[PDB]
Amino acid sequence: SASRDDWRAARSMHEFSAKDIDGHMVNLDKYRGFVSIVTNVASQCGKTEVNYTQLVDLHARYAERGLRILAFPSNQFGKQEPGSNEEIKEFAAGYNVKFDMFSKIEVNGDDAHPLWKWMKIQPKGKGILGNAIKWNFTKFLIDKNGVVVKRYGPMEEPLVIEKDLPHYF
Amino acid sequence: CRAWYQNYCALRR
């Protein structure tokens, strides 16, 4: 509010950019034409295993249809992502991740990545008790035009997204 | 740039 918030006027996830887990700046317009799941991850949560395994399942099954997964580590929830980006990359490799890992970010507060600020105010990005990210492994499903079409909370295992994603290919 | 994050432009014109 006192901060610059021209991010509010973006019309698509595809307008944004973010550093990948190796520190390289990626323009998210590469996802034009691809159904995407954007999620915040952490390594030291009780549901880390179920989330990583099922995200890998989704990518393995649907990458050929155009499914992409953008995983943003964050240490904002119980300090459950204390590692460096290199350590997080290695952790993801242990789950045979082949989707897109990003550098660690904040997802809540004034210093959150602006993509996350933007997703949280979208009509289909609404949370329950306000729009803040509540814990690790929130998921946003994004259509081929970069519009948010659904939000899933931490406790919704990634395979629940499988019911919805085929409508957007 | 419409939104900076750390040392890069997170939302280009």
Curated annotation (Swiss-Prot), chain A:
Read off the Gene3D superfamilies from this record. Glutaredoxin
Its Gene Ontology cellular component terms are: cytosol; extracellular exosome; mitochondrion; nuclear envelope; nucleus; protein-containing complex
Q: Which GO terms describe its molecular function?
A: glutathione peroxidase activity; identical protein binding; phospholipid-hydroperoxide glutathione peroxidase activity; selenium binding
Catalytic activity, as annotated: a hydroperoxy polyunsaturated fatty acid + 2 glutathione = a hydroxy polyunsaturated fatty acid + glutathione disulfide + H2O; 2 glutathione + H2O2 = glutathione disulfide + 2 H2O; tert-butyl hydroperoxide + 2 glutathione = tert-butanol + glutathione disulfide + H2O; cumene hydroperoxide + 2 glutathione = 2-phenylpropan-2-ol + glutathione disulfide + H2O
Tell me which Pfam families the record gives: GSHPx
Query: Which tissues carry this protein?
Result: Present primarily in testis. Expressed in platelets (at protein level).
- Report the residues modified as Phosphoserine: 12
* EC numbers, comma separated: 1.11.1.12, 1.11.1.9
Q: Keywords for this entry?
A: Cytoplasm, Developmental protein, Dwarfism, Lipid metabolism, Mitochondrion, Oxidoreductase, Peroxidase, Phosphoprotein, Selenocysteine, Transit peptide
Implicated in which disease? Spondylometaphyseal dysplasia, Sedaghatian type: A form of spondylometaphyseal dysplasia, a group of short stature disorders distinguished by abnormalities in the vertebrae and the metaphyses of the tubular bones. SMDS is a neonatal lethal form characterized by severe metaphyseal chondrodysplasia with mild limb shortening, platyspondyly, cardiac conduction defects, and central nervous system abnormalities.
Q: Subunit comment for this entry?
A: Monomer. Has a tendency to form higher mass oligomers. Interacts with FUNDC1; this interaction promotes GPX4 recruitment into mitochondria through TOM/TIM complex where it is degraded by mitophagy.
The free-text function statement in the UniProt record for this protein reads:
Essential antioxidant peroxidase that directly reduces phospholipid hydroperoxide even if they are incorporated in membranes and lipoproteins. Can also reduce cholesterol hydroperoxide and thymine hydroperoxide. Plays a key role in protecting cells from oxidative damage by preventing membrane lipid peroxidation. Required to prevent cells from ferroptosis, a non-apoptotic cell death resulting from an iron-dependent accumulation of lipid reactive oxygen species.
Listed PANTHER family: GLUTATHIONE PEROXIDASE, PHOSPHOLIPID HYDROPEROXIDE GLUTATHIONE PEROXIDASE
Tell me the protein family, please: Belongs to the glutathione peroxidase family.
The name under which this protein is listed is Phospholipid hydroperoxide glutathione peroxidase GPX4
